[model samples]
Structures are given as structure tokens and as C-alpha cells.
Target: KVFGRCELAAAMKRHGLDNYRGYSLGNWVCAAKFESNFNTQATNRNTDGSTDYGILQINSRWWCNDGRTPGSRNLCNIPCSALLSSDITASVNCAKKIVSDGNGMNAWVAWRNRCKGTDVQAWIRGCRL
Candidate 1:
């Protein structure tokens, strides 16, 4: 399901993404806005032989196991299938793992392109934090 901005921010908070690695909830919200538009079932094939899964666009190349990605690390230790669900906890968990790898939120191109250093607060405006 696609989420409104405030609701997505609120959901990210509930999933423990709020400042998970010093990035704000708004950063996550904004990235999600561009990445998957808060749609849990979103999947995207990259130019590489990998796929991006779920709201955070967790990659099958290194993070989640899709079985089709040769040499996949499955660092998130989850099936890519787990990501394409309305329950966003799996996606958020994978995102947390990805960011912790020292890339932080910039692990997501969408984050770098659309979220980081911008007025992220705009993403959470009028939303209770």
C-alpha cells in the first residue's frame, strides 16, 4: 500500500527507523517517497543482474536472497520475497542493516539524490514525532 508522507514517517518510527543511524525519520520518509513511494510490494530490476525490493529498495545483489542473484551475501538474511509485503518491518530491517554497513542512509541512491541535506523536515511536516 502507498502511504501518505506523515503516515510513512510515523510507520518508519514505529519500525525503529527513526534516527537508526543518525539519519532522521524525514530522511527515511523522503527516500521512501522516491524509492518505492511507500508501496510495500514494489520491486525494481536494476541495470545489474540484481533487483531492488520493497519500500526501501533493498538490493538482492548483496542484501536479501532472491536465489537468482549469484554470489549474494544475503546480509539481511531474508528472502527477497519477504520484502514484498504490506508489513514493512522486513523492508525496514533490511534498510537498517544496509545503512549500518558504513554507507549510512546514503546507501540508497534515492536518499543521496532526494533526501540528504535537503529540508527533510518537509517530509514530516505536521506529523507527530
Candidate 2:
């Protein structure tokens, strides 16, 4: 599913992700924008022999299996394709697990390089939720 910023924000809040794992909804919104442009079907192969999947672009090396990538830890116990679905339940659940593992948003390099330290309020602007 391709979601606009407001739509994504509303969904995130509905999923009880507004302030999950000590991270703000703004941070999540910003990360999703930078990682996959809010496209649930997004995927990218990294130069490091791994791939990123879905809205949050969770990594294949440690999170989920993309089949093409061997030796994945599959920590989330779901297929990478699962993250690409229009329904974000699996993706959101896996993301919470990822953050619980201690990397927080650092798991996404886009968040580290782009969203972090920026004014993420713009990502949620005009979303009355």
C-alpha cells in the first residue's frame, strides 16, 4: 500500500505505535518516508549482500528471510514478502520486535543518516491525529 503522510500517521497511531519503544511517532514517520517513501511494497538490495523490505525497510541480514539472501537470522519469523503487504500489521509487529532488540531506529540507516536530528514534525504536519 502506498500511503500519504497523513494516512500513514493515522494508521501508525491506530496500531498503538505513536510512542512505541521510546521512539516518537514523528521519528517513525520520518524513517518510513526516508526508507520506503511510505510504499509497503518497497524493496532494495544493499551492497553488503543484504536486502531491505517494506515500509521500514527492515534488513534481511538479521530480521527476515527474502529467500535470495542466505543465512538470514529470520528473527522476525516471517517472510520478507510479508512486510510488503498492504496490511501493515506484520510489518509493524516485526518492527516492534526489532526495536526491542536494542538497535532502535538505528536499524534503519536512513533514519540514522536522514531522519535523526531533523525536525520530523513536518512528516506529521496537518495530521490532526
Candidate 3:
């Protein structure tokens, strides 16, 4: 439990996110509850040509704007669906950074708020850090 939070925080910090108030661990905890039961190494293949992998369910192929390929770099290349083979630590950290940078924990909140929607921007609102 503590490790999850610590890793999550490190992920967030890597993305340059400093705020952890409005966006709480509850957001990620709930996501894990519904998504992969908090398994950071979980992998799910969706029928929509997309996938949810790792603790943060990163779809790197679609979300990662970086030009590198999936296995080219640490993990900044692979899409969420392709995260199973990527470095678990790097994947989690990358996902945390991406999520936090895009929406903070609020993204998780919003996903929970409405099943699954990209509310990352809404989550990062008023975040000063």
C-alpha cells in the first residue's frame, strides 16, 4: 500500500507535478479497484484496438507524443496497451508523470466520475507546483 503511494508520488514528481491535495491517492486507489485491482504489472487488451496496462493503465501507443518507439527508450515510447513488456518501474513512473502532467489525480477522478473519460486537464486545475 505504502509502496504504491510512494511510487505514484515519484511518478507524479517525475512529471513535475507538486500538488497532491485535490488530487488524492483515493483517485488512483479507486482506479486500481476498478481497473486492475492495483496491479502495476497488469495488462488488458481492449476490443477497440487499445489496451490498458500497468498501475496507471498507460496506452503509450496512443498517448505518448514522443517520437521514440515502444522499446527504444526507457518507456516513453510504448503505448499503454504495450506496457506489459516495458520496464515496470519506468512504465509506472512514465504513466504517473503523463497522467499527473496531463490531469493530475483528477484525471482518475474524472474517469471515476464518468466511467472513463480524459479529464486530465480538469484534474490539474489550480495545481501550483
Best candidate, TM-score-wise?
Answer: 1
Worst ten in a row by lDDT for model 3? 65-74
Candidate 2 Cα errors over 4 Å, as ranges: none
TM-score of 1: 0.94
lDDT of 1 by residue, 19-77 (tens): 88788788888898899988888999998789998888989999989989877678888
**Total backbone clashes of model 3?**
7
In model 1, what is the error at residue 97, expressed in angstroms?
1.2
TM-score of each candidate structure, all chains considered together = 0.94, 0.94, 0.46
> Which candidate has the top score in lDDT?
2
Off by over 4 Å in 1: none
Q: What's the C-alpha lDDT at position 118 in model 3?
A: 42
lDDT string for model 2 (90-116, tens) is 888888998888778887788899988
Candidate 3, pairs of clashing residues: 58-80, 59-79, 59-80, 60-79, 60-80, 61-79, 103-120
How should the candidates be ordered by lDDT, best one leading?
A: 2, 1, 3
Query: Candidate 2, 4: how far from true, in Å?
Result: 0.9
| Model 2: pairs clashing at backbone N, Cα or C within 3 Å | none
Q: Write the per-residue lDDT of candidate 3 for residues 55-123, one digit (tens) a residue.
A: 566653455423333442333654444445423455545645567565655444425664345443433
